[PDB]
Amino acid sequence: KVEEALKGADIKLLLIDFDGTLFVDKDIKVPSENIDAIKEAIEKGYMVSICTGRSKVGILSAFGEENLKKMNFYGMPGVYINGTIVYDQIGYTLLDETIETDVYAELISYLVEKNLVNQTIFHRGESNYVTEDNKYADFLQKMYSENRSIIIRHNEMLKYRTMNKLMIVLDPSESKTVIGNLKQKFKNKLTIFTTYNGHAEVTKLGHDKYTGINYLLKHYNISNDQVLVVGDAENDIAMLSNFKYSFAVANATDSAKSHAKCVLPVSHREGAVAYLLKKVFDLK
Amino acid sequence: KVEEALKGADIKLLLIDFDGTLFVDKDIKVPSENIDAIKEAIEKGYMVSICTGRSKVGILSAFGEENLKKMNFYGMPGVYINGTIVYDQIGYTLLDETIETDVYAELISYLVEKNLVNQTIFHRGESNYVTEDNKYADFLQKMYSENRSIIIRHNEMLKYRTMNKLMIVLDPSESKTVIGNLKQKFKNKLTIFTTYNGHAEVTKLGHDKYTGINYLLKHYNISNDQVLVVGDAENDIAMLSNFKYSFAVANATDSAKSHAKCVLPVSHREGAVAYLLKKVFDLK
Ligand SMILES: [Ca+2]
Ligand SMILES: [Ca+2]
Ligand SMILES: [Cl-]
Ligand SMILES: [Cl-]
């Protein structure tokens, strides 16, 4: 099933989702089987780009310094913050899109009246921020293997005129209600993806991983034919539907699985990425 | 609603769908109010781009030489063939994407097997072609006020290695059935949209009006904030979703109506483009 879906592919670019695909959890993180797979990928001439809602530093912290040295990979190139930040292979900033100030002012204003600021992670570039009254200040570290967000007073947070991303950490009690209301309030004003476990990710209208990825394709003159992509959740759908050699992990959402060419027989936990990469390697 | 939906918009680009939006049918073609609207938009300094599944010359035919003079508009800039052909204001080819030759070969092999070749309009650039045994040779001419398709022997048709688009003309009986089987034979291999009349428009994978439009945004450094868009059907949804000042005509499909910011109170035959542009004009 996989070998058939891969037949005839001349693959030059490997686009890998991070959470739910390459990264499994706080504990397993990225299995050594996957670190090896990328290591060999880079030795065999494949361009690797991770495509995530996370930042580069977020991805580098979850990997660890040792694994980076092991792979010889430092998140360049990469599509980050759901395609609003894109670096090339040598670190040039091909794209850095922040939310429009007016819309962003309307958003902070909503988040205050809806009382959600003290549970929002505020992202700009390679940094993220939370308020003094945030009970989940440890959240990206504890649950995603990142560094601790920087804690600042509430009225200092509202001084900033824009962000690349706002992650609203939601209780599974409130998710539906809060996201639905956020979606209708900022319909055609913001991009709002729902995290695997119920949180909201808010970015600039019109961008997602797929549009981030096009910058890399133009830059390095790589066609659709030559892209392998693999992912799991809502913000992977655009890149799963829009490439041919596209793959969903066994643990993917229903939508991810239907929009992908092919659903892998193996979960992220079981080394889905290493499994798929080795089947790409035996083509050449 | 509408003037509310436009509050404080600094619009510099008008992106107008053709059929179902600007162009009504055989007899009405494009209402005179719409022609004046475009005429004035160009005089008031707005960049205008028609975004459609049709070719440029297809749109210029339906318009007629006199209207083009009256508007001072000749389809440039433009997004044509669902984003696979794009012209800048001066007429430079920003993009001419054709189906991959391995996929195209498979596609034609599938069309013969299903005897669909004798009802399929083959598009390359500003030309389109049909087979000697095609009953629908007068189809674009009579139904859509275009120039007649060029007719050639079946064996001549399958000498061609690629096309920008195949529009499979379908009998309203067998739309659901034929497109269904088409969408699974070439899932993640081709873009297949369904026309308002249940016909199949087949283009290269990973392209739509939105991705084509982005060439114009980049070429002229126009931000999303500044883009006003209007449409009606399945092939408009990505541009209605990712833009802020996005409008669906009263006659739009349910999907288009929801993905847009705002549904117009007026339909395409009641002069919806004229209606919307007037409300955009008096912002200034
Ligand atoms: Ca993911
Ligand atoms: Ca249309
Ligand atoms: Cl992710
Ligand atoms: Cl159209």
Side-chain angles (χ1 to χ4, degrees), chain A residues 187-188 206 210 240 244 258 260, chain B residues 7 187-188 206 210 240 258 260:
Chain A
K187 203 179 155 298
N188 306 81
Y210 184 59
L240 292 168
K244 70 192 292 181
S258 39
Chain B
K7 171 164 180 180
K187 205 208 156 200
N188 297 88
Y210 183 61
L240 297 166
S258 51

Side-chain angles (χ1 to χ4, degrees), chain A:
Chain A
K1 275 187 246 68
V2 177
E3 281 168 61
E4 273 177 301
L6 223 37
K7 238 177 157 105
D10 178 16
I11 283 164
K12 297 194 174 175
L13 214 213
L14 309 165
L15 301 179
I16 321 179
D17 181 45
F18 202 67
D19 273 285
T21 300
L22 192 64
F23 186 91
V24 180
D25 54 51
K26 92 190 150 301
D27 302 344
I28 301 158
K29 305 198 226 153
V30 190
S32 80
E33 285 73 1
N34 290 356
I35 275 79
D36 298 338
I38 295 162
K39 183 198 182 63
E40 192 175 42
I42 294 156
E43 289 164 355
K44 295 204 173 184
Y46 297 83
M47 182 162 299
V48 172
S49 162
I50 290 177
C51 304
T52 191
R54 298 172 78 151
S55 73
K56 182 164 66 60
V57 296
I59 260 162
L60 301 185
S61 294
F63 268 133
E65 197 216 343
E66 216 197 307
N67 286 339
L68 299 183
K69 286 177 188 184
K70 191 179 156 195
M71 290 180 291
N72 197 37
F73 182 64
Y74 295 84
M76 293 168 177
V79 179
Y80 298 102
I81 309 187
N82 288 332
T84 65
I85 299 180
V86 178
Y87 298 114
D88 76 353
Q89 199 177 49
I90 67 175
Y92 186 81
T93 307
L94 285 177
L95 196 66
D96 184 18
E97 295 294 293
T98 51
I99 300 152
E100 303 88 342
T101 67
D102 56 350
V103 177
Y104 179 81
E106 204 185 329
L107 181 59
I108 302 311
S109 191
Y110 179 90
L111 293 177
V112 170
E113 320 169 339
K114 275 319 166 167
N115 228 113
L116 293 157
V117 170
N118 289 355
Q119 71 198 71
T120 291
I121 306 167
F122 287 73
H123 291 256
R124 180 79 181 79
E126 300 302 338
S127 298
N128 51 83
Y129 308 87
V130 298
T131 200
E132 62 188 4
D133 280 302
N134 202 314
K135 251 168 199 179
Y136 311 133
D138 296 333
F139 183 83
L140 293 175
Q141 182 195 59
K142 283 186 189 180
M143 216 64 260
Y144 295 99
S145 306
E146 209 139 315
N147 298 329
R148 228 161 264 165
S149 292
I150 304 162
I151 310 149
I152 60 177
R153 317 170 161 176
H154 185 275
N155 54 212
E156 300 182 332
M157 198 85 269
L158 64 92
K159 279 195 286 170
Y160 295 128
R161 300 315 161 197
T162 191
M163 293 285 165
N164 291 89
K165 173 165 74 100
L166 298 193
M167 188 182 164
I168 305 176
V169 182
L170 291 165
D171 210 293
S173 323
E174 58 191 337
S175 270
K176 298 196 172 167
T177 311
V178 173
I179 293 174
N181 285 310
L182 191 58
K183 286 188 172 220
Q184 94 197 141
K185 184 70 173 179
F186 302 92
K187 203 179 155 298
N188 306 81
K189 283 181 179 208
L190 297 167
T191 305
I192 298 116
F193 290 115
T194 307
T195 300
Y196 182 98
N197 54 327
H199 314 310
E201 288 210 306
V202 181
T203 53
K204 190 186 204 157
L205 181 75
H207 309 261
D208 65 313
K209 292 178 191 182
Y210 184 59
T211 61
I213 288 163
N214 288 344
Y215 278 81
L216 290 175
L217 304 180
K218 297 294 295 181
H219 201 71
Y220 294 106
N221 194 43
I222 288 158
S223 51
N224 190 284
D225 280 316
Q226 307 171 325
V227 178
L228 177 92
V229 69
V230 65
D232 86 306
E234 201 194 0
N235 66 331
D236 294 310
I237 290 165
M239 79 181 181
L240 292 168
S241 307
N242 286 284
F243 292 105
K244 70 192 292 181
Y245 301 122
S246 59
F247 292 89
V249 292
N251 59 298
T253 313
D254 294 320
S255 178
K257 270 136 115 195
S258 39
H259 287 269
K261 188 172 176 182
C262 180
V263 184
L264 286 161
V266 59
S267 79
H268 65 333
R269 162 73 91 111
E270 295 157 329
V273 186
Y275 168 79
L276 179 71
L277 288 207
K278 71 201 270 207
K279 292 212 160 297
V280 171
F281 299 154
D282 60 27
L283 301 180
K284 288 180 187 179

